[PDB]
Each structure stands twice: as structure tokens, then as C-alpha cells.
Amino acid sequence: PQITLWQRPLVTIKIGGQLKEALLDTGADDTVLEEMNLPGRWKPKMIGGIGGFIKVRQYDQILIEICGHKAIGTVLVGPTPVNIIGRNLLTQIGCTLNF
């Protein structure tokens, strides 16, 4: 699709057997999801944003279906206020900005 930006660019994702909504976020290097139940091992990481940092669990080689496209990569799970799809996965689905 083409998505204009008059509203937040939310999409449906499927990850870990679960359906969620997430924001297509060109300002995010990485993908950060709300606390959720994922299988597998993970590693602790801290990440920064506008208001300081948060501790996240880093999961690698996770499958995520984003508005009907499949992608595999790193997903960070922790206390983010919004589910964010970052450039690590936006590149895999072929997303571009245009103006």
C-alpha cells in the first residue's frame, strides 16, 4: 500500500502467534514491542529515546508478518508506550518514504 500520514501509520502484525497493532516508524532504528509473551532465549539491552531509556529483552531471528509481508529479525520487548516497527524490518518489507 501507499500510506499518507494524516493519521498514525498503524498496521496489523502477527508475531508469536498473536495479533497486534504497531506503528510504522521511520524514526526507529529497531523494532520495539510492548511486553508480550515470546518463546525463546533473549538478552538484556537498554535503549534510549526522547525521555530517557528503558530496559528491553532482545530476541533475534523472530518472524513477524507486517500488513501481510513476512520479515525475520530482531525484536526488542519492553516497556515502550507503543508498538513500533523500525527500519530493521521496514527495509525487509520494501517500505520507502516519498515526497
Added chain:
Amino acid sequence: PQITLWQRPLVTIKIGGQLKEALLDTGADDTVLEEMNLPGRWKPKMIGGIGGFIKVRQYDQILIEICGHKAIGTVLVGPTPVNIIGRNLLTQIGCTLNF
């Protein structure tokens, strides 16, 4: 232009007589710039992001030239780690996401 997302989507902006770089950020509702010298009145505001909140100065009807396109709107100025162009201004320059 069309911008792919293998690198951060940075652009040059001109605001308040000054040249800066900023990130085209579809995950940002509003535009948030580093502390900088802007003329005019402003109002205090707090905004939230991944790691808590920050206090910003809200300036309205500010002219900003973003990669060669002009836009007028609200700019929030405060301790953000990165200069962010949000959807309030991305819509004015006609920016879309595509995949």
C-alpha cells in the same frame, strides 16, 4: 525524492535562519527540535516517548524549509536527543510511506 530506509532518513532543514539536520519520523505526531534559538513567544508543554517525558517550548506558526519544501506549523523545542520532523509537517510536504 524517494527515500529508502537502509540508513536513517535525515534531511536538511532551515528554521529560524539556521541550518540543521533532522530525521523524517513517521512515528512522531509532532516536530521536536534540539535546544535552539527561535524568536517569538512560546508555551510550556510536556511530551512523552520511549523513556519518559520531557519539557518543551511550543512555538506555533513557524516556517521550516524541509529538503526544499516549505511548511508552517508547530515546532516543539527541548531536550530531544535527535531533531525529529513529525507528521504535522510531513503531511504538508506530501510525504507518504509505500510498500
